[PDB]
Design a protein around this ligand. Structure first.
Ligand SMILES: COC(=O)[C@H](Cc1cccc(C(=N)N)c1)NC(=O)CNS(=O)(=O)c1ccc(C)cc1
Ligand SMILES: [Ca+2]
Length: 223
């Protein structure tokens, strides 16, 4: 997260870090057994780490649980990033408490101008690199369809939406992928892609979770 702030230990209790010997992506806990992340975060041998603030220090509120199954969306297209969403089932149920909590799925898509919370352990610089050990937070508004649509030279589908600032300086970045965008108390987005980070006229693109609730519910009902 570029241009954001230190969240505070466990203030975003649905935030997960995905670890394959190091943090590589974020995720959102949607109930005691399931994490939602980005399909582009798919890899073998994932350990889900809940209750994290400093990802390099055991602070006393962590739960580390191995993934038992990963399910990339059936129509994920890595070329276009369309349908960039994946479900990860935990080997055992998380113990839910104030510091480890699920986030609700939305029942409607959020509106343009709504302020959302984006969070992660990704790069904090628009140029160069610095990776934080504690969770970073950014408040940013959903952009209009028309300003999102003209935000890139690449194709933008109705399964994507934009959140951020066209002036630059505030955005998600490398390592925040898969993590949450929460608006109106629900999971409305997944950190998906962008051109660099925090570049003028180049806002973040996010998987539109409201379009996937039926598939998530179906899938977790049978796995
Ligand atoms: C990979 O390096 C990066 O710094 C960012 C990471 C990233 C990930 C998710 C969200 C954001 C964000 N700013 N909201 C940033 N991605 C890129 O910069 C990728 N852009 S890119 O322009 O370099 C690019 C474009 C097309 C292809 C096929 C590969 C790479
Ligand atoms: Ca820790």
């Amino acid at each position: 997260i570029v241009g954001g702030y230190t969240c505070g230990a466990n203030t975003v209790p649905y935030q997960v870090s995905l670890n394959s010997g190091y943090h590589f992506c974020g995720g959102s806990l949607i109930n005691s057994q399931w994490v939602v992340s980005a399909a582009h975060c798919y890899k073998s041998g994932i350990q889900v780490r809940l209750g994290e603030d400093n990802i390099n220090v055991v602070e006393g509120n962590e739960q580390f649980i191995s993934a038992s199954k990963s399910i990339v969306h059936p129509s994920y297209n890595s070329e276009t990033y369309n349908n960039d969403i994946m479900l990860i089932k935990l080997k055992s149920a998380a113990s839910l408490x104030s510091r480890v909590a699920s986030i609700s799925l939305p029942t409607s898509c959020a509106s343009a101008g709504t302020q959302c919370l984006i969070s992660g352990w990704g790069n904090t610089k628009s140029s160069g690199t610095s990776y934080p050990d504690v969770l970073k937070c950014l408040k940013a508004p959903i952009l209009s369809d028309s300003s999102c649509k003209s935000a890139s030279s690449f194709i933008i589908t109705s399964n994507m939406f934009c959140v951020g600032y066209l002036e630059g300086g505030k955005d998600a970045c490398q390592g925040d992928s898969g993590g949450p965008v929460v608006c109106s108390g629900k999971l409305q987005g997944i950190v998906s892609w962008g051109e660099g980070c925090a570049q003028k006229n180049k806002p973040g693109f996010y998987t539109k979770v409201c379009n996937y609730v039926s598939w998530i519910k179906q899938t977790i009902a049978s796995n």
